[PDB]
Structures are given as structure tokens and as C-alpha cells.
Design a protein around this ligand. Structure first.
Ligand SMILES: *[C@@H](F)C(=O)N(c1cncc(Cl)c1)c1cccc(-c2cccc(Cl)c2)c1
Ligand SMILES: *[C@@H](F)C(=O)N(c1cncc(Cl)c1)c1cccc(-c2cccc(Cl)c2)c1
Lengths: 306, 306
């Protein structure tokens, strides 16, 4: 028992992390087979990063302008190209540590692990959710650009995120690994801002089921509610609508605890109208929304990865 | 910016994790050079685990009774011995993935990363603190025994914890890697229980400094307090005393934010007497005590490991 924000073991990703330097800009790259992936703004200068024409900037570059360090070993760049907002640096050595991998794009509400890196060196690992407004509430300092987010499915790494920039509220924006930004953000210095967020309702319900599995029951009740009536309360509290498919996805957790999904909706209703009255749930005094139903089942059942 | 519960990259530990089976008991072992370390209760049966004489149980065992699987490769056991509450299984192959390492024992109030494992396969990584009552609030299911906790210092892994058991409140107890239990717990089935805990005051102050670094300032004030007067409030709220050495350790964070340590104590005082009045700090509605001053400086400055 117990319930923690759990990341995937990071080893398979650590073996892919490299340092990419262009001019005076150093950031992180992701090295798979014979290609290094990194944010294309590596080729921009201070004044470039205002309003740049990336095609123009790249044609002025040569292979030898890109310095790639795999630990203390230098990788020779033999080709370069742009794909949307990422660069693809062709190197003359395939990474012997390349795991089985995929490039997937995730949905807001889903989670992933982040391996924060600086100068190609892994610093720490933590779990994030893609917010409904397509930002992530990460932990990133200067030089973290190119750090990646990922999930692990048995032995296969699904890369879903590469870090690009911090927004003025301190939240973070990035792309999938085909270089397509999550949300309405661009790799230019504009006045872009996050835009309004909501709470991931299905995840909050999953987390209440984690609590019940772990012995927190004070918020349960005998009342029930309809889906339509619950969603009227969700709207008034900036929670997003609950679908029948969310209800179906919560089926297994429902069946394990014996608490009907709409019953737990009734409990969430009361928590929203009454607050928590000085009590806690799974060591939180807030309703937590960054665990998916998948995350609860994995942790409250115990699936591994090899 | 941003502040997350961050674990160390787990790769160096993942390469050491193995499966140890004795009879019908399977748990995890830690494989370094030619020795596998694991909880000695692996040699106990159901009825053994009531009140066992471990010396008696071990003399009845042979090398071939211990099955060790390093992934899909079987390691031949060539020697076995007890050291306090751990077994040391001598195998005929030195682990080629052995990192530079140390066996350290940590202090309550300090943090470490846990690589939760099942059947020798890494499942997930997360950050824990050693509680003042020598328990950890982990996330562990059946078969996690032998999972380890660790810190990373440049390239050196300091192992500080091996998991043994869950206590009736759902918290967790274990040993250092010389097999000496943290706190007054034994690897027998007794009515042992955690015993009263307190809040790690210096860590809460460190976390308030993380908040100020990250733009949360609503809890600051102009008042100050003396150390003696702060500690009178700490006692009334089950917070442990603050020492001059805690004040000294908070010096750098103080100097970076320009908020005197005793000033921040005054702020913590008010938070304890008034609560948080529907506001949050670093996305928490509770005063958080599982980040050391070291953790805040590492994350709010950006140190890596290689
Ligand atoms: C990479 F340089 C980097 O990690 N940056 C970063 C990322 N996350 C947090 C923080 Cl505090 C810093 C970074 C540094 C300078 C500029 C930029 C940037 C500005 C505009 C547009 C884009 Cl795509 C990046 C990011
Ligand atoms: C290893 F078997 C194991 O991981 N156990 C465990 C650990 N943490 C949480 C949970 Cl839910 C289970 C475990 C399983 C059965 C018995 C014991 C045990 C009982 C008494 C004394 C000791 Cl040292 C261990 C632990």
C-alpha cells in the first residue's frame, strides 16, 4: 500500500541523452540509432530568437557547426535537417543503447515521466500530466531544453514530449517528437500565455478510488447522482465534463472497491461544495488530478517493465 | 522554474536489480560485484515468519536452495552468509554494470529515491523522506521486498535503504545495506507499530524558500521572531525543534531570497496559527516537509549527475 507520484525507471532514456552545441547555445538532444533530435531553436542567437526564419537560419549552417557530445565521446554529424520544430542531426554512429521505442503524441489529461537534463547529463526524473490547456507544470531551469517526456510499456519507450520553453506563469511548453507543439505555442519570443485551464475530472475520480483502496473512506456517502446532474456541478467548479467513456474506463476500479462510479461522483460533488473540512486524502489537502485510471491500477496492482 | 518531487535518475540502480528465490518466496536482490544482497526473511516460510531463529534456519540451507535470476540469465550461488538482517549471496559472476557505490546510513529528515521492484524488474521510481519515527511513507505491494533507496553524488550511488515490511498504518520499514533496521522494528511478525511522528521543521522552511524562489510570496510578513519563541510554537504543533545548525544550513537560501531565517520562522508561525485560508503554496494546501535544504538548492539551481 501507499500512493506516490511515481515515474517510470529512467535508465533506458538516460542512455540516449547527449549534449548538442551550436554557436554559444548548448542544450540536450535525444540520440536514437544514428539520429540526434533536439529543439530547432538551438540554431538561434539572442537577436535571432525574436522573430526568426528558421529555414533561412538553417541553410546558413553546416554539419561542422553542430557539436554533439555523448558523454565524453564526440559524435560526428554527417547530415542535418528540419522537421517542424525539431532538428534531426545525422551522426556516423548508431547509439548501441537505443531501446525499442515509439514516437507517440499524448492527450491532455494523460501522464508521462520527464527526465530533466542539463548539458546532456540526466539530473532527475518526475511525473507530469499534459494539462487541458496543453501546458505541463514541470521543473525546468536554463539548459533543460531538449529534455524528453516518455512512458514505458513492457520494454518499449513511447516518447511523447520534448521540452522547449517556459511561459510567463512558470509552466512549460514543448512538442511531440515529430516537432509539433502541444497547444498554441511557437518557438519564438512573443507574448504567448497559457490560457485558461480546467481540472481533469476523470483523474480526480481515479485518485479517490486510489484513496479508498488505501483506506481513506471519510468522503464516501450513501447518496448517488446522475451523470447530467454531476456535470452541472463540474461546470460550476471549472471541472471538465465526465463522459460515459470515462465512466466505462473507471469500471475496474469501481468493481474492485464496490463503489459505483456515479456514487463516487456524488462524493466528489460534496467535496466541491463543502471542501475537505481540515481532513486529507492520500496525504493531500487538495483534490488531485494528475493520476490517470491507468496510473492508479498500475500502482495499486503492481505492473513492472523490462 | 517549477518545483516537483524529483527522484534521481534510476539507471545505475536498475542495472543491479535481480530476482532471488528461496523455496516459494521470491523477492528482490541487489547485485554488486560478485554479491547479491537481499532481506534475510527470504529463507522463512509462512509459519517460520512467526518467531524464527534465523541462524537455525540458515544452517539448514545450501547454496543450491538460492535461485538468482539476472534478467533471463541465472547466476550460480557459490557462498551464502548472514549480516544482521540481510543475506549476502556470493555468486560466480561479478556484475559488469556495478556502479561506483557506497553503503551509507541516513538520518531522519533526509530524503532518498526508491526504485520499486517486483521479481527483479524495476517498476517505478519516487522520492521518500526518512520520517522522524524511522518509517518511510512509501508505495510498496507484495513482492517489493528488497527494493532499495539511494542517492546519487556525481557518479557514485549511496545506497541507504532496503525495503523489508509494511506496518499496520500502511507505512514502511527497512534496513540500511548493512542489514541494520531503521528504528525499533524487527523482521518478525509481531504487533510492532510506527509510534508517534513529528513534522520536519527545517524541511518546511526550505520548502517555503523554494516557494519564494518560485514566486509564491503571500505568506511573507514584516514580523520577526526569536529562535526560542519560534520553538515554543513548533512544540505546540508537533513540529520538531529548530537548531542553530538548521539556521546555518538555511543560510544560502536565506541569502538568495533576502529573507532572514528567523523572518521565515515568523511566517511559518502565522501559517501554523492561521492555516492557509484557502490558498496554496507550490501547488500544495499543506505545509510540506519532505524536501531538504539540499533538495531545494539542487532543484532551484540545477545540479546533474554523471
Ligand atoms: C533551453 F535553452 C532552455 O531550457 N530554456 C528554458 C526552458 N525551460 C525553463 C527555463 Cl527557465 C529555460 C530556454 C532558455 C532561453 C530561451 C528559451 C526560449 C525562448 C523562446 C522560445 C523558445 Cl522555443 C525557447 C528557452
Ligand atoms: C516481500 F515479501 C514484501 O515486499 N512484503 C511487502 C512489503 N511491503 C508492502 C507489502 Cl503490502 C508487502 C512482505 C510480504 C509478506 C510478509 C512480509 C513481512 C512480514 C513480517 C516481517 C517482515 Cl521483515 C516481512 C513482507
Amino acid at each position: 500500500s501507499g500512493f506516490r507520484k511515481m515515474a517510470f525507471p529512467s535508465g533506458k532514456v538516460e542512455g540516449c541523452m547527449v549534449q548538442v552545441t551550436c554557436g554559444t547555445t548548448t542544450l540536450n538532444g535525444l540520440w536514437l540509432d544514428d539520429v540526434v533530435y533536439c529543439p530547432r531553436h538551438v540554431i538561434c542567437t539572442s537577436e535571432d530568437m525574436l522573430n526568426p526564419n528558421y529555414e533561412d537560419l538553417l541553410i546558413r549552417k553546416s554539419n561542422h557547426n553542430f557539436l554533439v557530445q555523448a558523454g565524453n565521446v564526440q559524435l560526428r554529424v554527417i547530415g542535418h535537417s528540419m522537421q517542424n520544430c525539431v532538428l534531426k542531426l545525422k551522426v556516423d554512429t548508431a547509439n548501441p543503447k537505443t531501446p525499442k521505442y515509439k514516437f507517440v503524441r499524448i492527450q491532455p489529461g494523460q501522464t508521462f515521466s520527464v527526465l530533466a537534463c542539463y548539458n546532456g547529463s540526466p539530473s532527475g526524473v518526475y511525473q507530469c500530466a499534459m494539462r487541458p490547456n496543453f501546458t505541463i507544470k514541470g521543473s525546468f531551469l536554463n539548459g533543460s531544453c531538449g529534455s524528453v517526456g516518455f512512458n514505458i510499456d513492457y520494454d518499449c519507450v513511447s516518447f511523447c514530449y520534448m521540452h522547449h520553453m517556459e511561459l510567463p506563469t512558470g509552466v512549460h511548453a514543448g512538442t511531440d517528437l515529430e516537432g509539433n507543439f502541444y497547444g498554441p505555442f511557437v518557438d519564438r519570443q512573443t507574448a504567448q500565455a497559457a490560457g485558461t485551464d480546467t481540472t481533469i475530472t476523470v483523474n480526480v475520480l481515479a485518485w479517490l478510488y486510489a484513496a479508498v483502496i488505501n483506506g481513506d473512506r471519510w468522503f464516501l456517502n450513501r447518496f448517488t447522482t446522475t451523470l447530467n446532474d454531476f456535470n452541472l456541478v463540474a461546470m460550476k467548479y471549472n471541472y471538465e465534463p465526465l463522459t460515459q467513456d470515462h465512466v466505462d474506463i473507471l469500471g475496474p476500479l469501481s468493481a474492485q472497491t464496490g463503489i459505483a462510479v456515479l456514487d463516487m461522483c456524488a462524493s466528489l460533488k460534496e467535496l466541491l461544495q463543502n471542501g475537505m473540512n481540515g481532513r486529507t486524502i492520500l496525504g493531500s489537502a487538495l483534490l488531485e488530478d494528475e493520476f490517470t485510471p491507468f496510473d492508479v491500477v498500475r500502482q495499486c496492482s503492481g505492473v513492472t517493465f523490462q
